[model samples]
Target: VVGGTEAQRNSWPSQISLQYRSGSSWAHTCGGTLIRQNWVMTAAHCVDRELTFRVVVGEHNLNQNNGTEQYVGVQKIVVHPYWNTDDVAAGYDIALLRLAQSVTLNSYVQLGVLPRAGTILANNSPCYITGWGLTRTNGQLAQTLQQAYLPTVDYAICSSSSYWGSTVKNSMVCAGGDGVRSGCQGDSGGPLHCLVNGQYAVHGVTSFVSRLGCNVTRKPTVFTRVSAYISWINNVIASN
Candidate 1:
């Protein structure tokens, strides 16, 4: 994230590093949230490459050793059926990964509680975006996790002309257009933790940023609204 600070090891226990395996090497591509012991929520585009991928939980420093870490292979991928690659502006970018085995939850790892079905945050609601994404546009990945304050921009305001315009839809959440903090390439599919009712719950999945830059003044980072797909998520897990 642009204009972000390093996140503490236990700051975001549900955060997971989504990586791609190539021969003897594994590279971080996107971020995800551990929704269940055997499930991870991410972006459909992250799994669009068709590469062997794995999920890493309780990971802090990607280049260095961290006492809390759990690696697991992806046994199944469930991209939203309505997801359209050529229609990003149309939303529905979410995807889920079923882990080969259940991960143990602890201080460094836990489940991300999703917002209630059909719930929507009001304008300027307090929130945060965390990930191992770039610190600047077109920059290298951060050595450690980073987080930035990203207040919610409700659907109406976000779709306004001066903001995200039509590109931001009802199924999406927009935040951090403040010309300072914003999500970048490596942050896609990560969690957008918003404070509601004195508690924090994940309301969004990081999806896209302005083509202009990562931290453009009136262009907030767009995300797939998690609340809009709560039922679909439940059905996917139940059926599989």
Candidate 2:
């Protein structure tokens, strides 16, 4: 994230590091939210590349070990059938990764809470975006996880001409267009945890940001609205 601070261990327990094998080592490609013992919620774009991917839970830092990590291979990739790589603006950017085995739950690793179907936060709602993404546009990835105070940008303002405009859709959530803190490369599929009624829930799946820069004025980070697909998520999990 751009203009973000280092996140403490287990601060975001559901955060998972998604990686692909790079020779003898693995490289972090995106961040995902652990929604179940055997399922991960992420962006469809993250799996567009044909690479062997793995998921690491209880992960804090990417380069160093925090002693609580659990690495597991991906058993399956279930991208939204309507997802179009060339038409991300059309809003079917969600996907699920089934883990090879169920992971044990603990303080350092737990499932993320999801908002109810069709729920939408009020304008400027309290939220945060967390990930191991770049510190700036075209920058290198961070060694540890980072998070930024990225409040929700309601569809009205976000879809205005000065903001994301026509590219923004009701199916997406916009946040952090302050020309400061925001999601960048490697942050895709991460969670936009919004606090409501004293509890926090995963309300978004990181989707896209301005091509011009990570943090741009009126160009808040866009995400797939998790609440918009709760039904599809349950059906997939139940059938599989």
Candidate 3:
């Protein structure tokens, strides 16, 4: 993430590293949230490419062997039926992955609490975006996880002409248009944790940033509003 600080280990337990096999090695491609013992919520675009993917829980640093890490193969992927790879602005960018094995829960690895159905944060509500994405536009990925405080920008303002315009849908959440701190490349599918009633909940799935740059004025980071798909998620988990 741009203009972010190194995140403390175990601070964001549900945060995961979504990696794909790259030749002989695995490379971090996006971030994800552990929504269940064997399910993860992420962006559909993150899995658009056909490649071998794995989810790593409790991973803080990509280069270090953090003993807390638990790697698991992806058993199945289910992208939202309405999600069109060619048109991300149309807004159905959510996806779920069923893990090959259920991960163990601990201080460093746990399921992310999701927001209640149809819940929407007030304008400028407190939130944080965490990932191992780039430190800047066109920059290299951070070796360690990073986090930035990205306040929510309500739909009305975010959809204004100067902002994301009509591309910002009600089914999405926009945050951090301050042009300082924001989500960047490789941060896709990460969680946007928001504080509500003294508890933090996963309210968003990081979807896109302005093509101009990671941190652009009036172009807040857009996310697939998790609350908008609560039923879909439950249905997928129940029947699958």
Candidate 4:
């Protein structure tokens, strides 16, 4: 994440690193949230490319073997049926990944609580974007997870002409267009944790940032609003 700081080791236990087998090595491609013992939530765009994927739970530093980490293969992937690679701006950017096996829950690894259906945070509500994405636009990815405080940018202002305009949909969430802290390359598919009723819930699946720059004025990071897909998520999980 651009303009982000190293996240506390235990701050986002539900955050996971989604990686792809890159010949002799595995490379982090996107971020995801553990929503169940064997289910993960991420952006469909993250898994659009056909690749072998694995998830690293309880990962702090990407280059080091954090003893608490649990590596799990993805057994199945379910991208939103309406998701079209040619039209990400139209929404339906969310996806679900089923783990090969259920992971053991521990203090360092747990489920990400999701927001209730149709729950929208008020303007400027407290939230945070965490990931192992780039530290700056056109920069290398961070070794450790980074987090930045990014309050909500309500649809009203975010969809204005000067901002994201019509690209900002009610089915998505916008946050941190301060031309500072924001999500960047490799952060897509991560969670937007919003504090509601004294608990942090997975409210968004990191979808896109402006093509202009990672941190652009009036171009907040956009995410597939999780609340907008509650039933879809449940149906996918139940059927598959």
lDDT per residue (tens digit) for residues 1-240 in model 4: 999999889999999999999999999999999999999999999999999999999999999988999999999999999999989999999999999999999888999999999999999999999999999999999999999999999999999999988988899999999998999999999999999999999999999998889999899999999999999999989898
Which one wins by TM-score: 1 or 4? 4
State the lDDT of candidate 1 residue by residue for 59-143, as single tens digits. 9999998988999999999999989998899989999999999999999999999999999998999999999999998899999
lDDT of 3 by residue, 1-240 (tens): 999999999899999999999999999999999999999999999999999999999999999998999999999999999999999999899999999999999999989999999999999999999999999899999999999999999999999999988899999999999989999999999999999999999999999998899999899999999999999999999999
lDDT-based ranking: 3, 4, 2, 1
Question: What shift in Å separates residue 55 of candidate 3 from its native position after superposition?
Answer: 0.6
For residue 136, model 1's alpha carbon misses the true position, in angstroms, by: 0.4
Which stretches of candidate 3 lie above 4 Å from their native place? none
Query: Which ten contiguous residues of candidate 1 have the minimum total lDDT?
Result: 160-169
TM-score of each candidate structure, all chains considered together: 0.98, 0.99, 0.99, 0.99
Where does model 2 exceed 4 Å of error?
none
Error of 2 at 210 (Å): 0.4
**Residue 87 lDDT (model 1):** 88
| lDDT computed for candidate 2 | 0.95
The alpha-carbon deviation from the true structure for residue 121 of candidate 3, after best TM-score superposition, in angstroms, is 0.6
Error of 1 at 223 (Å): 0.6
- In order, the Cα lDDT scores of the candidates are 0.94, 0.95, 0.96, 0.95
